[PDB]
Design a protein around this ligand. Structure first.
Ligand SMILES: Nc1ncnc2c1ncn2[C@@H]1O[C@H](CSCC[C@H](N)C(=O)O)[C@@H](O)[C@H]1O
Lengths: 425, 130, 41
């Protein structure tokens, strides 16, 4: 059992990030504790370097000083903290000539381009680790080929509406008569589209106390956007006001195993269409995805909730792991079914299994129709992705969005199937 | 059901405590809630219904015992329950329990708005000490 | 945020002769004496 006798000497897609990535932040008083940055074909990501033994309170994971971020108030007037825009600079007129509630992304894009031009700004170095125009997964960069494949008239209309708004803003504020200090920020219309895409896909709104002032800031925190999204996060963002440090803290009393990814929820609860519009990604396990349904047929959700060990109020629906034992089927996807499915419930009225069985097939009779509405199948799309070897990443996300929606329909079909038979016991 | 030897369904457990709350049997209600925790279930959601039922059946004094005991545990009640429970106590002249409940709400992550203070003032204005 | 209320009134005032008697309840003093010179009593 001696170390000499013991001879210790997968996950190939994930490689350790460039050491300079953490080093350029480390010199700026950025500390990451027990975690390391790994990159792959999907992108960056923070993965634990060791087992995180749970404590009484939340454990500090990362610290980001304020001076490394780009922050702008959500509400007029537009004041920038770690103030980088000089007084009288023409870029402020562009920022100030924006919609107070619709053009939050545009105001961040102007600051983002302005920061890249500044020589002393930290983001001119951190900008090299941002995804390029092709690598970014934002739908704002997608063309009609990916949008048509997306198969969502509502989502496509919104995306094409944003593209016109962003492009026309660049045309108005980047004509031939602008000063060179403004022209060099966006030499072509395409770059400004990429700037807005980064702003939309990486803004982190938060109420922070800077000194004696409390306000809501559309922040651009570095090293913290790299955290991926999950509706059941293992860590959250906490702003420490005394030293202007943004703390990334793992949930209190939760153990993180070696190599586990650290994730935060970008939005509290939203549907995949909102995530595609904002961040350009979708999750099949979204507990907030809905689906239109006729109200004629309904079931007893209390029986449905209990059979999958789902407890709490609808605002706090969650699944219990130890009660179910293993239950590999139950996930966040079926939790959304508890909300989007038409249901009925009285004080304590037990349901009629035959009537529900009469309706479960009738419910599933409708469920096969939506899958038939989409010409492709859930497995057909993912098979295409594996076969696909040369395409834009927005095309893959558009495939994933319709695949996740189709699986969400596929998941509930199985969910009603197991629910129907389990109702007998 | 216990004699047969299988775990009762949560819906059955929820119906039990609600029935106890309808008759105001506080001792029975808390005993069943302890069983759920011993059965490793979500006591909080059932605990809300039992407290509401006691208030519904005008068993306010018993409701204070159940609500406070859950409040000291750490579970957070709904916004409606805090508003309902505080207002009933102040209508019944139970500022001592209402103030204690309000403190538990503050520790629960919800801050007393103007509505909650108005309920407390309705009783303090009659104490004779401005 | 509910302040932890702590009301402590500290009143002062003239005392009625009855309450003076209440302090001595019987504590009537008549002899202008003290410890005895010899017996120390
Ligand atoms: N849970 C998740 N699943 C899939 N993609 C995700 C994700 N969370 C974040 N992303 C990706 O990251 C973008 C948000 S910015 C997050 C940084 C990014 N993950 C990176 O590696 O640099 C999304 O548009 C999406 O492309």
């Amino acid at each position: 059992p001696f170390p000499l006798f013991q001879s210790p000497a997968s996950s190939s897609e994930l490689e350790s990030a460039d050491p300079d990535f953490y080093k350029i932040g480390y010199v700026r008083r950025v500390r990451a504790y027990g975690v390391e940055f790994k990159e792959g074909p999907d992108g960056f990501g923070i993965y634990a370097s060791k087992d995180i033994e749970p404590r009484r309170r939340a454990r500090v994971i990362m610290e980001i000083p304020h001076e490394l971020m780009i922050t702008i108030r959500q509400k007029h007037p537009w004041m920038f903290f770690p103030d980088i825009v000089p007084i009288g600079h023409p870029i402020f007129d562009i920022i100030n000539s924006t919609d107070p509630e619709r053009d939050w992304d545009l105001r961040l894009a102007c600051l983002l381009l302005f920061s890249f031009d500044r020589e002393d700004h930290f983001w001119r170095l951190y900008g090299d680790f941002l995804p390029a125009a092709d690598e970014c997964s934002s739908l704002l960069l997608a063309t009609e080929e990916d949008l048509a494949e997306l198969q969502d008239p509502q989502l496509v209309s919104t995306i094409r509406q944003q593209q016109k708004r962003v492009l026309e803003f660049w045309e108005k504020n980047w004509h031939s008569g602008v000063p060179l200090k403004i022209k060099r920020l966006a030499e072509d219309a395409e770059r400004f589209i990429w700037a807005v895409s980064i702003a939309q896909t990486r803004c982190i709104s938060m109420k922070t106390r800077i000194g004696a002032l409390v306000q809501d800031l559309n922040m651009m925190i570095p090293y913290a956007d790299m955290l991926n999204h999950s509706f059941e996060p293992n860590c959250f963002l906490h702003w420490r006001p005394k030293d202007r440090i943004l703390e990334v803290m793992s949930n209190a009393g939760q153990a993180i195993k070696k190599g586990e990814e650290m994730t935060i929820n970008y939005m509290p609860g939203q549907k995949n269409n909102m995530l595609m519009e904002r961040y350009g990604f979708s999750t099949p396990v979204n507990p907030w995805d809905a689906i239109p349904f006729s109200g004629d047929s309904r079931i007893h959700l209390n029986s449905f909730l209990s059979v999958f060990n789902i407890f709490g109020l609808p605002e706090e629906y969650y699944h219990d792991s130890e009660l179910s034992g293993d239950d590999s089927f139950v996930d966040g996807a079926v939790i959304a079914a508890a909300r989007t499915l038409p249901t009925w419930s009285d004080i304590d009225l037990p349901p009629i299994p035959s009537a529900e069985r009469k309706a479960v097939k009738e419910l599933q009779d409708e469920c096969r129709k939506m899958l038939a509405e989409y010409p492709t199948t859930s497995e057909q799309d993912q098979k295409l992705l594996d076969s696909l070897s040369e395409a834009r990443t927005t095309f893959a996300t558009a495939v994933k969005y319709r695949m996740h929606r189709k699986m969400f329909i596929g998941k509930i079909i199985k969910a009603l199937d197991i629910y129907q038979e389990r109702l007998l016991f | 059901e216990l004699g047969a030897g299988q775990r009762p369904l949560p819906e059955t457990m929820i119906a039990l405590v609600r029935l106890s709350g309808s008759k105001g049997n506080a001792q029975r209600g808390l005993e069943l809630l302890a069983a759920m925790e011993k059965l490793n279930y979500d006591i909080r959601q059932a605990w809300l219904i039992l407290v509401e039922e006691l208030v519904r059946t005008n068993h306010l004094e018993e409701a204070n015992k159940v609500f406070l005991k859950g409040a000291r545990g750490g579970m957070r009640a709904t916004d409606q329950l805090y508003d309902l429970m505080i207002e009933e106590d102040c209508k019944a002249g139970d500022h001592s329990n209402a103030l204690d409940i309000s403190y538990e709400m503050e520790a629960a992550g919800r801050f007393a708005t103007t509505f909650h203070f108005n309920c407390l003032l309705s009783v303090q204005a009659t104490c004779g000490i401005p | 945020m509910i302040d932890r209320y702590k009301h402590q009134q500290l009143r002062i005032g003239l005392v009625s002769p009855q309450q003076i008697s209440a302090w001595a309840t019987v504590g009537e003093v008549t002899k202008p004496y003290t410890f005895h010179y010899k017996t120390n009593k």
